[PDB]
């Protein structure tokens, strides 16, 4: 009834979707061929027999990642027509993914999404998985979000985006794509749960004892976050939280909608054996500045909204005591215009351990979505890099000779300056 459609764009989105759907199949007992040896309805559809087709599309402008999906262990899980692929990728170019290469694919993607929506009864919204500093993860994501806003102008559109890291980076033109995507989607998005590869690397090293993690472990952690977010739709709990609940409780103003994701019980097997992870402990770990999965120090800013999504053996009184302890803390400061900055969700299903993963089996877990003004510093860094590269006008010819104008660069930079001003304004205390 509360069906939701997940859209995975680009290599980052497709691989995170691989991890997410592996986790969903494990959680709901669905075999990797769609058969089982309700709860599995907001994300899967039943076709006559036991076949459960996931309610998602995998769209990329490059055949490689989608073909890996098509021939992997989950080759028979996804509908072959919902694994949409192109011929030539966007080559880390926003213009290619938005204007030149993305226009030859957007119609097919919209047709498939329309088929999925028609197959649904009540559509809660969309989950868009993508990366900020990619070609199709930026241009095609922005194009798709604007087309969805044109079509489904009322359904919520939550996006899980890999924010560029402060120091580590795999591409040279990431600031351009990030600024342009922020412009275009900020026009047409509800809330964007943000994450950094560098922060997850640090989390893995410090907590999971892994010194050489790959993208696979990062995707597993992100999939755990997404599972904690969607558990209320997929399972039954004391306090249910829907997508509209996220949108309402985490977005104070239409432009300030970039919360940061966190996951407390990130722990290895032996350490989990030696610990007694409780509600208070996991809450304190969530509010620890070193456990943030976006490399921004929360002490540099003020929280405006927090969404604590507990799951498993969790008692509401313990949650209330832990939240009261957090509020009594002095290092954790909130904005003065949000006397109540905690949306609490509790689910009865403990997190499912993926066979072959690094996370240990725990009795309870919490995912914390925090909207804070500490993201303003990350925005400032991103626009500073954009300003340097645009002042030298580097790489601009690649974007211009592909259906874009330098005026769009200037407009996107001005919009980002306005966003920084808005963050500064909401940061200050009322007088």
């Amino acid at each position: 009834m509360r069906e939701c459609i997940s859209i995975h764009v680009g290599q980052a989105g497709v691989q995170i979707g691989n991890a997410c759907w592996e986790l969903y199949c494990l959680e709901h007992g669905i075999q990797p061929d769609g058969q089982m040896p309700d709860s599995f309805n907001t994300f899967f559809s039943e076709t006559g027999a036991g076949k459960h087709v996931p309610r998602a599309v995998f769209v990329d402008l490059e055949p490689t990642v989608i073909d890996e999906v098509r021939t992997g262990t989950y080759r028979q899980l996804f509908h072959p027509e919902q694994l949409i692929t192109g011929k030539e990728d966007a080559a880390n170019n926003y213009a290619r993914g938005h204007y030149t290469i993305g226009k030859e694919i957007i119609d097919l993607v919209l047709d498939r999404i329309r088929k999925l929506a028609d197959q649904c009864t009540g559509l809660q919204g969309f989950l868009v998985f993508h990366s900020f500093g990619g070609g199709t993860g930026s241009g095609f994501t922005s194009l798709l979000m604007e087309r969805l806003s044109v079509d489904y102008g009322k359904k919520s559109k939550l996006e899980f985006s890999i924010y560029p890291a402060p120091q580590v980076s795999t591409a040279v033109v990431e600031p351009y794509n990030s600024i342009l995507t922020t412009h275009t989607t900020l026009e047409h998005s509800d809330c964007a749960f943000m994450v950094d590869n560098e922060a997850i690397y640090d989390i893995c090293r410090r907590n999971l004892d892994i010194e050489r993690p790959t993208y696979t472990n990062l995707n597993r952690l992100i999939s755990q976050i997404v599972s904690s977010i969607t558990a209320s739709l997929r399972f039954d709990g004391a306090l249910n939280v829907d997508l509209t609940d996220f949108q309402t409780n985490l977005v104070p103003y239409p432009r300030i909608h970039f919360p940061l994701a966190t996951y407390a019980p990130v722990i290895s097997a032996e350490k989990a054996y030696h610990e007694q992870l409780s509600v208070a402990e996991i809450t304190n770990a969530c509010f620890e500045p070193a456990n943030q999965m976006v490399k921004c120090d929360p002490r540099h800013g003020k929280y405006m909204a927090c969404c604590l999504l507990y799951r498993g053996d969790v008692v509401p009184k313990d949650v209330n005591a832990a939240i009261a302890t957090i509020k009594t803390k002095r290092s954790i400061q909130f904005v003065d215009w949000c006397p109540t900055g905690f949306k609490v969700g509790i689910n009865y299903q403990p997190p499912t351990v993926v066979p072959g993963g690094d996370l240990a089996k725990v009795q309870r877990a919490v995912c914390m979505l925090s909207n804070t003004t500490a993201i303003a510093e990350a925005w400032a860094r991103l626009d500073h890099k954009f300003d340097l590269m645009y002042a030298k006008r580097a790489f601009v010819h690649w974007y211009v000779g592909e259906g874009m104008e330098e005026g769009e660069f200037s407009e996107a930079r001005e919009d980002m300056a306005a966003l920084e001003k808005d963050y500064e304004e909401v940061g200050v205390d009322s007088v």
Binding site: P63, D89, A91, A171, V173, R212, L388, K392, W398
Partner: protein
């Protein structure tokens, strides 16, 4: 899908192309008779970018072998992997153009370029989705430089939207293998600036240094140098071909290393270069590969990057490796050498990772560098060109073939504009 047309011009181009097709057939498990004798399905998953399936499941390289002399054609045909190319793709003349750019560009290059253009049009119309072209040649040569230039210009005006990238062997700083090398190199570079998307400048003396000092080869022959160049070409189009964690085709690399249209000259490289003696003492890790590829000794052009600043770099890794290690090595390289990277381009590194390593290796990587140290090579070419042109040496050949001194002046002015742009940035 994303088919590439490979054109080999001149002796240098033909020999390097023969080695390139040998290594490519090794990667894709193609018999020297054209049959697939491989083991994995990924070899045939993307065989179409380089090969055409013939009648009896025999794979014919999508290569055009063009030369103005028949000796190289006979040598390629008679040797191993010579029965691999299509016999209709050997387009050659009789007179070998000497070492004259004008002969290969204006007198014999005309007829031979009409023929090779017909062949290239047939090959392109056969293709399903043309990704672009690649040319192997030498700028200091005769038919190689001039004819590769003419073919580049004509194919560019026929297919302007495709990616044209060339692996050109530039003149060496110390010892020249041709007396008229500056003239041919200057004219070829003047034509390459406007009609090419990616020019990988390779110098034979840097290759000799690599073979003697890094590979400890006592008697390095042209086979080893061509193997190195072929490994670089492999790495790039392998990022294109095989599945990976972070894909990158030719156009993505072109976007991430060409900030301005005329600044498209690169220093290639290859990380896992070890002597047979030291292969047991060295740990093959991403930090080791990165440290070697960013070393100024490994770069395949005799231009020290410490004398300039990297506009952009591209690291195409191959093999199963952790993305975190790659990204952290990239960040450490950028932080340590902050003085050697341009400030107005943040994150001057473009990272691609492919899953399939080259045969016989567990990890590998190719380094492409758009640096302002190519200005040194162009400056050397300019000094030599103006030294010979001021006293008008060896010029009557070029004039008699049908050229003019105005063309030489335009070529040197364009190359000086190139060095001015590099120095400015």
């Amino acid at each position: 899908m994303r088919e590439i047309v490979h054109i080999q011009a001149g002796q240098c181009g033909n020999q390097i192309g023969a080695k390139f097709w040998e290594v490519i057939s090794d990667e894709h498990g193609i018999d020297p008779s054209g049959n697939y004798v491989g083991d994995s399905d990924l070899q045939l998953e993307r065989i179409s970018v380089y090969y055409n399936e013939a009648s009896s499941h025999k794979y014919v390289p999508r290569a055009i072998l063009v030369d103005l002399e028949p000796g190289t054609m006979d040598s390629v045909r008679s040797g191993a992997f010579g029965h691999l190319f299509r016999p209709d793709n050997f387009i050659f003349g009789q007179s070998g153009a000497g070492n004259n750019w004008a002969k290969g560009h204006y007198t014999e290059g005309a007829e031979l370029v009409d023929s090779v253009l017909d062949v290239v049009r047939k090959e392109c119309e056969n293709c399903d989705c043309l990704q672009g072209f690649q040319l192997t040649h030498s700028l200091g040569g005769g038919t190689g430089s001039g004819m590769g230039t003419l073919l580049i210009s004509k194919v560019r005006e026929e297919y302007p939207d495709r990616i044209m990238n060339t692996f050109s062997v530039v003149p060496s700083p110390k010892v020249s293998d041709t007396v008229v090398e500056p003239y041919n190199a200057t004219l070829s570079i003047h034509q390459l600036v406007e009609n090419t998307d990616e020019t990988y400048c390779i110098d034979n003396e840097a290759l000799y240094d690599i073979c003697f000092r890094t590979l400890k080869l006592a008697t390095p022959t042209y086979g080893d140098l061509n193997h190195l160049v072929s490994a670089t070409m492999s790495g790039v189009t392998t990022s294109l071909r095989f599945p990976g964690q972070l894909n990158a085709d030719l156009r993505k690399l072109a976007v991430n290393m060409v900030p301005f249209p005329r600044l498209h000259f690169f220093m290639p490289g290859f990380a896992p270069l070890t002597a047979r003696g030291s292969q047991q003492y060295r740990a093959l890790t991403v930090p080791e590969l990165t440290q070697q590829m960013f070393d100024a000794k490994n770069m395949m052009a005799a231009c020290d990057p410490r004398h300039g600043r990297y506009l952009t770099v591209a690291t195409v890794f191959r093999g199963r490796m952790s993305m975190k290690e790659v990204d952290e090595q990239m960040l450490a390289i950028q932080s340590k050498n902050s003085s050697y990277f341009v400030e107005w381009i943040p994150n001057n590194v473009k990272v691609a990772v492919c899953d399939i390593p080259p045969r016989g290796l567990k990890m590998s990587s190719t380094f492409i560098g758009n640096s302002t140290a190519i200005q040194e090579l162009f400056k050397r070419i300019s000094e030599q060109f103006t030294a010979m042109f001021r006293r008008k040496a060896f010029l009557h050949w070029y004039t008699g073939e049908g050229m003019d001194e105005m063309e030489f002046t335009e070529a040197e002015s364009n190359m000086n504009d190139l060095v001015s742009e590099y120095q400015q940035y």
